[PDB]
Paper text:
The results indicate that the CE and CI spliceosome assembly pathways converge already at the pre-B stage.
In addition, the U4 Sm core has moved upwards by about 5 nm (compared with pre-B5′ss+ATPγS) and now contacts BRR2. However, the position of BRR2 and the conformation of the BRR2NC RecA domains are not substantially different from pre-B5′ss+ATPγS. These results point towards an essential role for one or more of the B-specific proteins in these BRR2 structural rearrangements.
Residue numbers in the entry:
A (entry chain C): 116 to 951
B (entry chain A): 1120 to 1314
C (entry chain B): 36 to 57
D (entry chain G): 241 to 255, 270 to 274
E (entry chain A): 245 to 438
F (entry chain A): 585 to 633
G (entry chain U): 100 to 555
Amino acid sequence: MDFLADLMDNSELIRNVTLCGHLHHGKTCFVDCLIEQTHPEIRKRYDQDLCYTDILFTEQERGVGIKSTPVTVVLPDTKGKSYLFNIMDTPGHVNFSDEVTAGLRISDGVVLFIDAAEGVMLNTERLIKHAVQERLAVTVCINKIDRLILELKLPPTDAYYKLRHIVDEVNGLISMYSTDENLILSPLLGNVCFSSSQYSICFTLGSFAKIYADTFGDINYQEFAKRLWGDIYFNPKTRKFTKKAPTSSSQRSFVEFILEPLYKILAQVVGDVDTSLPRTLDELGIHLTKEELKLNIRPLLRLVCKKFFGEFTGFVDMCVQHIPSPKVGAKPKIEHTYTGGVDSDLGEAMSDCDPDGPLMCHTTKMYSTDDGVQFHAFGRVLSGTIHAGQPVKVLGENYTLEDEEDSQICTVGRLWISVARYHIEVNRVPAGNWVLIEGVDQPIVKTATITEPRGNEEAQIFRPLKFNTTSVIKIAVEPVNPSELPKMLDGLRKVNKSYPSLTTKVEESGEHVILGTGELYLDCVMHDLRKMYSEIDIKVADPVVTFCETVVETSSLKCFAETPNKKNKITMIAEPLEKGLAEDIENEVVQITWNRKKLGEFFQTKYDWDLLAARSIWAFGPDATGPNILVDDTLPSEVDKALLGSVKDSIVQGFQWGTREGPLCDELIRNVKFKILDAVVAQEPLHRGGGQIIPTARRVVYSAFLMATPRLMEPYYFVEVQAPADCVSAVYTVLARRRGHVTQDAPIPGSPLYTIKAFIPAIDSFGFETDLRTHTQGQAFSLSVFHHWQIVPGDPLDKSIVIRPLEPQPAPHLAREFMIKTRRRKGLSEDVSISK
Amino acid sequence: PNNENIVGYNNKKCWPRDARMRLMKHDVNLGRAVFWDIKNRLPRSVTTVQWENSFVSVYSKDNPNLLFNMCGFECRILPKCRTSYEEFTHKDGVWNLQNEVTKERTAQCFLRVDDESMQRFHNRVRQILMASGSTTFTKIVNKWNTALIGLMTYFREAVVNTQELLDLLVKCENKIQTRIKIGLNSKMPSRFPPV
Amino acid sequence: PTGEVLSLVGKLEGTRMGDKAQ
Amino acid sequence: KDKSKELHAIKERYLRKFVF
Amino acid sequence: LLTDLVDDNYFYLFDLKAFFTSKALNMAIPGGPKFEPLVRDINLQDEDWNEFNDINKIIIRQPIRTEYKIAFPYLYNNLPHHVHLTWYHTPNVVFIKTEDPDLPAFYFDPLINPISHRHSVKSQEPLPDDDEEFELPEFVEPFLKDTPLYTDNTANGIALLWAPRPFNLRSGRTRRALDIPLVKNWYREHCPAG
Amino acid sequence: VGQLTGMYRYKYKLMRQIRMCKDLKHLIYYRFNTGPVGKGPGCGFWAAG
Amino acid sequence: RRSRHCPYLDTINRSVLDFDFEKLCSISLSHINAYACLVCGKYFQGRGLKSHAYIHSVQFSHHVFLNLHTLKFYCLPDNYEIIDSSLEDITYVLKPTFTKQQIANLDKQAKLSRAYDGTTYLPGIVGLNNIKANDYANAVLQALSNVPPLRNYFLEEDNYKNIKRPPGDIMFLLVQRFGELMRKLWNPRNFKAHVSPHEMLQAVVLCSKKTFQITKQGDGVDFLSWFLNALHSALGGTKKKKKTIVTDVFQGSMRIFTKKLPHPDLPAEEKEQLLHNDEYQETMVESTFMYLTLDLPTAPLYKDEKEQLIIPQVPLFNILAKFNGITEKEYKTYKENFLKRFQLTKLPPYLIFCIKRFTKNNFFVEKNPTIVNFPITNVDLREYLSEEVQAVHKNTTYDLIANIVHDGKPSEGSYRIHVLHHGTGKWYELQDLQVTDILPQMITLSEAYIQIWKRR
RNA sequence: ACUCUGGUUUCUCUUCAGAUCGCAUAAAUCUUUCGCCUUUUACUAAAGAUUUCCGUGGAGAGGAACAACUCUGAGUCUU
Ligand SMILES: O=P(O)(O)O[C@H]1[C@@H](OP(=O)(O)O)[C@@H](OP(=O)(O)O)[C@@H](OP(=O)(O)O)[C@@H](OP(=O)(O)O)[C@H]1OP(=O)(O)O
């Protein structure tokens, strides 16, 4: 037990991994198998999956993992070397992408999981991109190999064909996301593992070569581990592996020396269990008693495969030599994560992960207790050492060097490293490891840079947790009895803490609004809000979708705005951006930190913008990645550049906030270009203050937007469904009912299931996940995630459109129906006026 | 601070929730303000105006219905101008209004019998039935008819629109018939003529 | 046929109070 | 007839004898 | 007497947990039974027209059907007391029972979409050549050479994995004649077909 | 049982069982009288009820 | 640096700042960097560009704000610190700085304090706002106030931070919020002559869970029994502090001699042998009390023959006669009765008298409306102690400080409080915001429920 | 490949039962809430709390039958 702490002290025998993968792909069962390997007293039930890491009750009843769970375990390697493994088995549901990112910032390794009978799915398509964008080594473990044999009953050659088709599709798809050309995955190289979690089967080519070497002996398992995967074969007469076929009915090496023995052993334990089973266990050295042979087929298969393969050494040596150690992976993690990068003193102090250096651990999760009162933070100690009772300094997400007010000095109460259900109390946690810090819940929402007090003077914070999806769905929350409203404020704060992309908000009409990704996500968060944190009654409005406001054409007149003093006068024009330019802003392709020359060349080549304005672009919409843009287009002779540069900041401040709110209603402004045609600034810095410019800035922005023909943009969810070919029409009929349209219907190779990829309006996608399965009697299944935004049909600003109370309106009325009710939901005026 | 002025706001629950006066923030605040203004005038020792035993109905841009039980007649006034289309006469308990200055149908008063009157009539029938130790059948039925026309000539058009009152009337008449039939013989008959 | 009294709820489609009483 | 039925359903949501 | 259902995804909203939810909500699945309300709450049914549940603030695109409120009983409804959860979308087991008495047990039947293996792009991997610094011992062989890939009792054994509850047991206890509901899995089915 | 024996007249709850059995009949019959079987008194699947 | 001077100093409104609400962001539900606008009085998330405070400042044109943690003022639209001589007064409201001389010069204070709204008052004599059924909470908080031993431990913030708080300590918020509320009410200069316990009932309902919910009127005795216990337990982490600031003030040692099985079902000879058995006799049951309980005679239940419906007036000494060896009360429970006689062996500096008005019958709970005639400035308790202990105490005389009077039925109650302003003799009646200098006779006329004394 | 190893079946008695005792499912009584309500006996149909009923698992004890054919772990596991 103390060897756990001894290995904990070292920083090179430690791996930080995430077993990220699609929904229901065996990740939780894989961790359960690892636990069953380590802990002997923990034995899985004969039929019910134990689901060890599924510790909260809601995922124990719904059957889907919801929140990532830390697992700290010592795993022997193929050669028997112990390694300390930090496992963050992220939930697989695409609506739960919050926890994938939350566990991916604090990990250096990505262990993908792909169902052998399902192939690459929607989820994985985004996790490979995300992990590459976060600069982690990516490794694939095709799980549920049993499906190719006990369910599909494929010939072993076709099983290998399926395996290579799903292996190279990962390589082919990842080549778009990965700039480097060292990221080619192949089991012969050691990137790819093969496993069946239910039957505990797990191997890399090296491990299986180790089994053969163990049996026959005098075998070098490395050379034989190579020359297994591929189109090469084996010659029984010359005992050499050849590219060409040694016989007419030849067979690939992998199939011949790995897949075929698996087929035979599991067929012997599911067929002729009574006649030819002892014969095939004598030939394999697996000795069993009478009472362990009287079990059912599934437990017998799991036991026999545990005896044959043994411990999960294949996963261990797959992980060890193909993901960097924290001492090695710290440099890319820091240069992508720390705001100042490696260049700063603290940045250079991170490249080596010194256990005695400065402590600026990073926490990215909130694992509540069983009473829900206090929140135990979870984070990685990127460097330094932490102790129980140590007086520590917790930073925030708005904390900077200039803004020293966003921090708190706290006392680390206790420290313990956690493995799912049970936690191990430790007085000291060294660098490069994980920990649940206690007593730091008060000054944190979501991420935090918990660092030393009065010891890290110039230390900055870590970058905000950037996600892959966007919080789209929006639900109103109120107490049943307003006499217990404060009881619900703290519950909303708690759920905001325990959900990385949850966005609580109070609006002008005294409305509490919760933002989420999908139906199941909001179901889980409100179940937590009701039965866990607030233990009161809560009324919910039916889900509504956040909208966006855009333009399609230039304004008829150059509408302007002046300060109340009638001295400053700013004239601006709102026009749409080039198709695809908005995406090239949100993807961090271009930034405001760029120098002028690079952005000028970018807009001169890719978007053919004139250099007279390409070097006169101030801001990029709201926040930093906002899709809108502010453009300076005043001729220098009429607007003094020296005089302009004073309000150059305030105009942006009134613009970065001007586009955030939106004149039509309190919704984001997207895909709009603002050209300034005239500036009349006060010649003295006295009357041109921010309190006068900023209202004028927002007013001129709103006036230009309104005078330009405005439109609403609704977010479309990208829905994939997997159904047998008899139910493809049953998906077309459902998707046609909700204004959707199908993009592709591709059968999955090596499986009768299909994959129908379509788009569906988010406001029109409520219940579709149930409207499909019930219509197809549960055979079909859908997953949804936000893809893009589209102009809502119709003109949002027509007064001839009448909104009936309780029946859907046609497409042309939608743009009018959506905002007005939204306006009514916002508490604003019924219509829009040019004064706004 | 909590919008706690809606937790105890009395309302005419019998009407449908669209007909029932709607509890907007501004309207509830106005109603409570008006009631407080009225209550403050009267000295608390001379007399008092209890809110829980009172009803405030507000008609505004948000509420198109004005509700009140005047003398047992729960009336909902709904203007024709605001929310109406193709006004009719097929319902017998719906008073057409009339603007005397212009002589045009401008409002619509829906009539109803309040819960208090229905409960009072049911209790009257109950105390008729329980006070039948030796009373003749004729005495019981005379009391029943007198009680029936005591309200039916009083509540005339409202009875049509109060379906629960009709059900209660039929139930009580069946109770009277059952009482008489039990008075005749212990074992209730399978049929029994109205003659 | 039975002597039990049937509620005239839903039985008022074609009748008025003042009808058959002049 | 589906439209009228579904709108009606929306309005609904938001607003002795031994017989064998 | 056995439906040929391999998984339980066909029982999406006809599980007994979903029926417990429907009972506790006084709501009925179209194929499900009706129950008396757990709590009358007639006054709570007669909730007033507030600024929260105001119609003019609500966007209606597709009606919130009962099964929506049953699948997500903490999102689409209020006051979910004594409610149970079920979303057990077990990965829909892709099993193809054999029909040919004579066929290889592991056969690539046409019900499976072909893999369509390709070699168009030279996506090569580290591979050896002939007689390149490697040699295999004469003793070493694949583990199971003598035993056939599939016996006669292989297809039956594999098809026996996805049999109903009574027929996936190699051994088990004895039940009474009373306690065996033969048509239990008949009215538990989704609906009767017309 | 109700038609053949008037036991329901001596314990009303039995109607449940009565109705239960009849419901079971319907379940088995519609599954029994399928295809070319036709309608008639030819079902003896009594263990259900 | 234009930080020191501001052209927006006059826009501040001092009568609108109501600092008794929860210090959490209104817009986005956070406690971090809680910044309060001074023009209108709303809470925000903090400084920074495009921040909620910044958005409000550039929208409402409200410039000068306030920091609730650093207590340093800011102008957000340009975001620079603000320092002014007059503005300091505002900082004295939310965080009153009661230096030790002000504590030492407060029992000798006889000047009516000034409020910004003009509502005159005396410190300590302050109306606690009844937001929702806080009558009992306001009553117990006011009665716990005006206790100089407890008064001199919470007016300074540097008294209760040094205590050890375990990692599982979830009740220190009670102590710190009690201290802060006491500083708010004891404030010589505040904008409002009242104060809202809105920040205090939240800590009460967090520490006591759903119990003592502000929805329903709580029980005073049941309240302070838990409240003093919680104050005692919070002060001291993982260390048995048998004597803390509240224990050596109200707790007193008490002797009980208890005999059992006097049950009438036993015959005379069997009971004689039982008392002869030497197993069932008076026992050494000395323990501690946080407050002395007073048991009243039952209501007359009958009209007096001459003056009908006579009001039952009983002298206090008859009630206090319970605490001596002469009298013994039968606290019968379950099968066998228990005859207990009480005795006092250590008088606390301040003696609390809880009064058992509300009691459950066999069927329904009623109240005992028996008036008590009790003095307020002269009482002797020397007869209730053994002489082997009487020599230790040279002060057995107590003077009334606070009194609790209840109204009506248990389910419909409205507490009222009689507070004595020390130094003077003005007895003031506070229900929610009431202030009235009553005479020393209306204290006797009303029926008392909880009394606070002082041994001097 | 040497050893000691040593029964399962069956019928009872006595207790303990966590667990779908039971991959099945009845009845009664009581307290609430409806429905009916004309009094019991039947009910009504949900809730809660009980009890009996048809069964069950485990442990132990006592007989009987295969009690003596075996058999299992242990071992030094002896060319
Ligand atoms: O009313 P059901 O119970 O459904 O059954 C009656 C009928 O006689 P019973 O009324 O006495 O049952 C037959 O039912 P069995 O006598 O066979 O039980 C008949 O069934 P067959 O056509 O198989 O003879 C048919 O029952 P079903 O409609 O279930 O086939 C029919 O029903 P209806 O009289 O209601 O049409």
